[PDB]
């Protein structure tokens, strides 16, 4: 891939230049060590002058002049090697600065781009979007970042220890403080950012229901963390409690309810190299709520762990995607609309649960189509024609051209607060009502094309006129939520086009949609041409004999 293999180039380049500094560090370590032994030779030259100063000037003539020559040269060498030791120290800090600034570039790419892309993909998958996929790619990149930063951290620890053993003043001290300032800044960011929720908890959480979540740390294996697997504490929080948590204005263990099994320990898995806490049996015990259906909450996962050193401790916190809490499950219907809006229209880097008031119509379309396909479980989504029908209903306009609605904004109030033109419901109620009846028992029929649905009473009439005396279509009724009305043709005294009473799921519980179509004589050709028993053959109930009626084997009528 494009910037996928570009990452690997600037990753390998980091490992190469980090090895060059490793070579220069072991080299300087030797240069210094020799210099220390040579300095003791300079000290030992003087003590030699004392034992030399005993005998006659017959021996002292040669001894004192040779010892002077050896002391001058060694003293000039020690003085030049002393500058060399300092110059080399600087060149190592310059190199360490260079590989760290380059490491920051690669860090930001992994964390602020590829990670955010994964998290956005995850966000939209809540609304039915495409799956975000495995973290494998980002774990490998995070491990590299963790490894390279750790290597550079221990290198500058060793570089520092040499300086304390042999101090040389100047720029070195300040440049070393700067590399350390950067080194901690990089690890802190790397640590906090890779404590992520792999499998988010249910966004429409029903009280007293077993739910699950999975919080992975991407730098578990490649750092001194899996050795002591840390305890992770799940905690339900409010939208205000989250805005405070992020601005650092929290007050102790502030929260909004109890969670059974809200504590779990991370597990290290060899081969996968993954450190992950799978909260398999969580459950909501109670809630706080100072609309109920428009109330955002979040599962706050926290943990504390050390990274090798006893001093090096980090406190990690990650927030779940906003969840709406329900108790009776009856209001799942409206909860879904708030979650839908949030998952679709959340702005990157927003303050906790900041969604826009209005959005342009085709933005909302994208979302409705996304969720629609996902719910009815079919590849047949909302066509440009169906999109016009919903634009007509929502905006209360007459136009049949989709491009007309392009600049129009749907507010949250227009979507699921104020009711439609002359109805006892909102657009989301009508739309979700339709997905619900389809999903509940019409998934095959929708997929098979047998339910045109998104056509108005007029649209249906200006279609079945030019059709034989039994042609009919299936339509979504505007008056009865989740209702499917039949539009058919049959020439009689006054009327020749007819709209039968809409069927609600109640009616479908008694007799099937297919059992009801086959039950009616007049209905004989499904629109446009297709015969009735051709489209609904499959779904016809083969009346099976009862046991009470005395049948030893399964029989049909
Ligand atoms: C074996 N079998 C299944 C039967 O018994 C079949 C017999 N049947 C009928 O013919 C019933 C009996 C009463 C009148 N009737 C009708 O069919 C009449 N139709 C209506 O009364 C209405 C049509 C619409 C359409 C909309 C709408 F288009 F969707 P909108 O866009 O405004 O929402 C809304 C309200 C209404 S009221 C008639 C066709 C005009 C004669 C009938 C019985 C119990 C039913 O329960 C559900 C459907 C249904 C069907």
UniProtKB/Swiss-Prot annotation:
Keyword Methyltransferase: no
Positions carrying Phosphotyrosine: 539, 551
UniProt keyword list: Activator, Cytoplasm, DNA-binding, Lactation, Nucleus, Phosphoprotein, SH2 domain, Transcription, Transcription regulation, Ubl conjugation
Posttranslational mods: Tyrosine phosphorylated in response to KITLG/SCF, IL2, IL3, IL7, IL15, CSF2/GMCSF, GH1, PRL, EPO and THPO. Activated KIT promotes phosphorylation on tyrosine residues and subsequent translocation to the nucleus. Tyrosine phosphorylated in response to constitutively activated FGFR1, FGFR2, FGFR3 and FGFR4. Tyrosine phosphorylation is required for DNA-binding activity and dimerization. Serine phosphorylation is also required for maximal transcriptional activity.
Keyword Transcription: yes
Modified residues (Phosphoserine): 56
Subcellular location: Cytoplasm; Nucleus
Record-level GO cellular component terms: chromatin; cytoplasm; cytosol; nucleoplasm; nucleus; RNA polymerase II transcription regulator complex
One MF annotation (Gene Ontology) recorded for this entry: phosphate ion binding
GO biological process assignments: activated T cell proliferation; B cell differentiation; cell surface receptor signaling pathway via JAK-STAT; cellular response to granulocyte macrophage colony-stimulating factor stimulus; cytokine-mediated signaling pathway; defense response; development of secondary female sexual characteristics; development of secondary male sexual characteristics
Domain SH2 span(s) in chain numbering: 446-543
Major subcellular location class: cytoplasm
Family: Belongs to the transcription factor STAT family.
Subunit structure: Forms a homodimer or a heterodimer with a related family member. Binds NR3C1. Interacts with NCOA1 and SOCS7. Interacts with ERBB4. Interacts with EBF4. Interacts with CD69.
General function of this protein: Carries out a dual function: signal transduction and activation of transcription. Mediates cellular responses to the cytokine KITLG/SCF and other growth factors. Mediates cellular responses to ERBB4. May mediate cellular responses to activated FGFR1, FGFR2, FGFR3 and FGFR4. Binds to the GAS element and activates PRL-induced transcription. Regulates the expression of milk proteins during lactation.
Descriptive protein name: Signal transducer and activator of transcription 5A
Source lineage: Eukaryota, Metazoa, Chordata, Craniata, Vertebrata
Parent-record interval covered: 138 to 700 of 794
